[PDB]
């Protein structure tokens, strides 16, 4: 209830993001579309990927509960007696920061048209080795022209609020962010707690985007675009197709607290070169 409009927005944002890049891929492949969802969670991107008519989906999360949970969502959608075609899926429980997904694939020679990391990548930055391995699992299997897309905290905006704050903690009634130490912002291992209304689930790490961009180059990825949630909304809402979708999802106008929570995050996408 409290977080309603914010919940809606992220699924609007993720749908518009996926929809955009599924078109860019369809301008090339338009067949056997393979996708890797990193940190798939309990699913929820499933219905998004079905909408885009994906031919294959690899869902992976470090939590075995979320993976088995996500697998039931797929099966539930899959097992209707209807005609509707659903992507061939795959479910892999692994730590993508510390593990190599290539070993866990049914087909280890598998290639992906799209890799979606939604509110995940910031977890991998605990260390360089971890942060690089996550980029590896994602981008190494992208066939050229494929996209690495996702969403992570800004880290310009995060520190900006921290430095303005009197204590290490900052936020509002709908969310609370607590850094372990203020003023020290190491490229890796910079650690803070992200607590939505609820209990804080796991610590996050600071992702400075210029760094993520540099490390992505290792895997031959060039940045397509990087935009804050504010910039993304302003632009993509220009389309009156998308504006209908947001009012349909009943997202959009939130409390000043909800609108504050967003604009911390930024969407991004990379493209694999030859
Ligand atoms: N190293 C890791 N490997 C895989 N998943 C991870 C991970 N670290 C965190 N995660 C997962 O990141 C997710 C955060 S939220 C769920 C994101 C999902 N794409 C959605 O939009 O619903 C959690 O599921 C968490 O288990």
Residue numbers in the entry: 167 to 440
Text lifted from the article:
In order to characterise RNMT lobe function, a deletion mutant was engineered in which lobe residues 416–456 are replaced with a GSGG linker (RNMTΔ416–456). Despite the absence of the lobe in this mutant and in thermolysin-cleaved RNMT, the crystal structures are not altered significantly compared to RNMT–RAM (RMSD 0.5 Å). Moreover, no substantial differences in the position of key active site residues were observed in the crystals upon deletion of the lobe. Removal of the lobe significantly reduced cap methyltransferase activity, over a titration of RNMT, with or without equimolar RAM 2–45, indicating that the lobe has a significant role in catalysis. Since RAM can partially activate RNMTΔ416–456, it activates by mechanisms additional to stabilising the lobe (discussed later). Many lobe residues interact with RAM and deletion of the lobe considerably weakened the RNMT-RAM interaction to below the limit of detection in GST-pulldown. Deletion of the lobe did not impact on SAMFP binding to the RNMT monomer, however RAM 2–45 was unable to stimulate SAMFP binding to RNMTΔ416–456, consistent with a defect in RAM binding. Removal of the lobe in RNMTΔ416–456 leads to a significant increase in flexibility of both the α-helix hinge and helix A in simulations. In agreement, the average isotropic B factor values for the α-helix hinge compared to the whole protein within the same crystal structure displays a marked increase on lobe removal (average B factor hinge = 28.2 Å2 versus main chain = 23 Å2), in comparison to the RNMT-RAM complex (average B factor hinge = 24.4 Å2 versus main chain = 24.4 Å2). In summary, deletion of the lobe reduces the catalytic activity of RNMT and impairs its ability to bind and be activated by RAM.
The cap intermediate is methylated by the RNA guanine N-7 methyltransferase, utilising the methyl donor, AdoMet, to create the mature cap, m7GpppN, and byproduct, AdoHcy (S-adenosyl homocysteine). In mammals, RNA guanylyltransferase and 5′-triphosphatase (RNGTT/CE) caps the nascent transcript and RNA guanine-7 methyltransferase (RNMT) methylates the cap. Human RNMT is a 476 amino acid nuclear protein consisting of a catalytic domain (residues 121–476), with homology to other eukaryotic cap methyltransferases and an N-terminal regulatory domain (residues 1–120), that mediates recruitment to transcription initiation sites. RNMT also has an activating subunit, RAM (RNMT-activating miniprotein).
